[PDB]
């Protein structure tokens, strides 16, 4: 009948990595960010035990959009009060708070499940050039 397909036994092992986005686009960075979060390319994936890794992105300010998306697309956030529509433009976040943009996009990458609230704690993005995460000895790689 069945060969009793093997699932892991919470033998989750993670690694740390550094991805310095210099001239990347938001979507193609986010797709591979989610790929690394869920371990899609890892041979040991099952959705029931969160086989993922750690991702740390540096120099978030330097990510650039394309075309006329800078001044046309609006980002909206809602407060449960009346008329609380915090509406901003791309050039506003890219100067004031840039980590929020990638954070929200990557949180948009992951399924609305009970692991996303644990999947998103695995990403660390910094606006500036220096980070205090130099305690896990990560490996650098680009286009991921």
């Amino acid at each position: 009948k069945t060969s009793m397909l093997t699932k892991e036994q919470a033998n989750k092992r993670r690694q740390w990595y550094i991805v310095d986005a210099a001239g990347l686009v938001l979507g193609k960075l986010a797709v591979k960010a989610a790929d690394l979060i869920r371990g899609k390319n890892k041979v040991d994936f099952t959705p029931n035990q969160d086989c993922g890794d750690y991702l740390i992105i540096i120099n978030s300010d330097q990510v650039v959009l394309t075309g006329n998306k800078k001044e046309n697309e609006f980002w909206y956030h809602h407060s449960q009060y009346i008329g609380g529509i915090k509406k901003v433009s791309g050039r506003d976040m890219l100067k004031k708070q840039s980590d929020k943009l990638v954070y929200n996009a990557v949180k948009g990458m992951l399924p609305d499940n009970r692991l996303s609230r644990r999947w998103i704690t695995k990403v660390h993005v910094f606006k500036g050039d220096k980070h205090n995460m130099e305690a896990q000895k990560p490996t650098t790689l680009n286009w991921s």
Binding site: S3, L5, N41, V43, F45, T46, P47
Partner: protein, 114 residues
């Protein structure tokens, strides 16, 4: 002959209630609710006995693609190199758990190249 008919009701209700064990709330004590709960549970079991044979196949394909993207080639290309050339009807769950036996799947990976 006046008929009392007591055993049948008790045995039917007990049999129905026993089926729905480990149920939230009073749904494991009220026969009238227990029968509806077991009806819905068995309907879900009926649909899931196909949904699981589909979802396992989905995870089957996903975990094959996970290993094959590491060799720099496409999963569809691997299925192609199975079918038209070097004819192979090899099992997918076979080649999946041949990831667990290390490097033995790589033999099939290198064999598709004539």
């Amino acid at each position: 002959m006046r008929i009392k008919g007591g055993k049948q009701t008790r045995v039917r209700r007990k049999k129905w209630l026993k089926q729905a064990s480990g149920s939230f709330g009073t749904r494991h004590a009220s026969y009238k609710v227990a029968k509806q709960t077991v009806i819905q549970a068995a309907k879900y079991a009926y649909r899931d006995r196909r949904n699981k044979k589909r979802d396992f196949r989905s995870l089957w394909i996903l975990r094959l693609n996970a290993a094959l993207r590491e060799q720099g080639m496409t999963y569809s290309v691997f299925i192609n190199l199975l079918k038209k050339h070097n004819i192979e009807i090899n099992r997918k769950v076979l080649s999946e758990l041949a990831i667990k036996e290390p490097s033995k799947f790589n033999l099939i990976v290198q064999k598709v190249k004539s």
